[PDB]
Design a protein around this ligand. Sequence first.
Ligand SMILES: Cc1cc2nc3c(=O)[nH]c(=O)nc-3n(C[C@H](O)[C@H](O)[C@H](O)COP(=O)(O)O)c2cc1C
Ligand SMILES: COc1cccc(-c2cc(F)c(NC(=O)Nc3cncs3)c(F)c2)c1
Ligand SMILES: O=C(O)c1cc(=O)[nH]c(=O)[nH]1
Length: 365
Amino acid sequence: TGDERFYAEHLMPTLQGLLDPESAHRLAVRFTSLGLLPRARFQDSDMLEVRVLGHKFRNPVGIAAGFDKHGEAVDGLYKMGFGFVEIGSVTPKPQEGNPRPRVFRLPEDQAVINRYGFNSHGLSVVEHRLRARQQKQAKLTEDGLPLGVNLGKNKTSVDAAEDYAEGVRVLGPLADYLVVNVSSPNTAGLRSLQGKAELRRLLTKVLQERDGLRRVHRPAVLVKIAPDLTSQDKEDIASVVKELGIDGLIVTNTTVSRPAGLQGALRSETGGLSGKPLRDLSTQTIREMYALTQGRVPIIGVGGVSSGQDALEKIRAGASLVQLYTALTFWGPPVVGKVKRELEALLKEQGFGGVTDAIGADHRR
Ligand SMILES: Cc1cc2nc3c(=O)[nH]c(=O)nc-3n(C[C@H](O)[C@H](O)[C@H](O)COP(=O)(O)O)c2cc1C
Ligand SMILES: COc1cccc(-c2cc(F)c(NC(=O)Nc3cncs3)c(F)c2)c1
Ligand SMILES: O=C(O)c1cc(=O)[nH]c(=O)[nH]1
């Protein structure tokens, strides 16, 4: 479309030339929360519909956690054409995160590095914000537009499991699914929650708390993992997920690795790397996790998705749904309709009746 080319070639590069990435982020959230958007003309066709996690998803393209950390722009994100929205990560108490600057653009790599450090309005603020639109969300969900909430841990928390449990109790009743984020590269000690004994204990507590919620307010629980795990780590996660009956996996968060070939001047900043250099690392992690769980655990695939081809590669690797974030920062709102339109065309070209038929297709070749 003309909007796609206009955003990608004119509007977005101009905004990027004028604003540091954090200011750009804050502006994006503001414009989105106000519905000031090109408003996609793409009608979701039936072949993009997916049923998973106890819900219908009108299309399989979601906005990844971190864009709307505090639940301020949920409705504008659906207007942008996302099939589902994940907010967060949200921590129990409000916290400021790391000192600025803490977000860095690598335009030559179509990548971002961030070290926000879980800046969060906290559970109470987000709870009230979601309560104010709770019935509007119930309608959206019923119409195939579910809401996910991603939970984090405070920097000074003395008991990680109790932080997550508090999030389940407070935001679980407002969410279609919850994500236990044990994969931020930007909170000391967080990723070691991915180890076997620690993960089993943590997830047992989260699931107990979830199961204690009333039936209509009981969300699916997913675990979001890093792309930097050892083979042993991945095996252990797969085993725990199956033992406890975890509902799904989100694969993957940002990477602390710095792949050979990064060109951006800021490539050596501390933080998680997202965008194109993460893409195939994430796809391969999806492929491994799908195999280790025998295709029985739904996976949301995320990392470097910017086109229908990228989305379909993750779906064929084993993802039931995909998310993007970094691509929005480069291409702007029209990227959402672009991914959906290209995905539909490719499904047709590859002889799939719909997204559902393509899930895990590479493992059946
Ligand atoms: C600026 C920024 C902030 C993020 N914040 C969070 C977060 O709070 N919680 C989370 O689980 N993931 C967070 N992520 C990770 C994204 O959800 C996603 O896993 C990752 O960026 C890979 O997708 P992408 O390549 O499409 O950006 C963040 C990513 C970025 C770039
Ligand atoms: C009508 O025009 C619109 C409407 C709605 C949204 C945008 C829009 C603008 C932007 F500057 C960005 N960029 C970022 O958020 N950068 C970053 C986010 N997190 C780390 S860096 C965006 F993603 C979207 C433009
Ligand atoms: O807040 C952050 O720093 C953050 C959290 C997360 O889960 N992933 C990420 O890349 N950054």
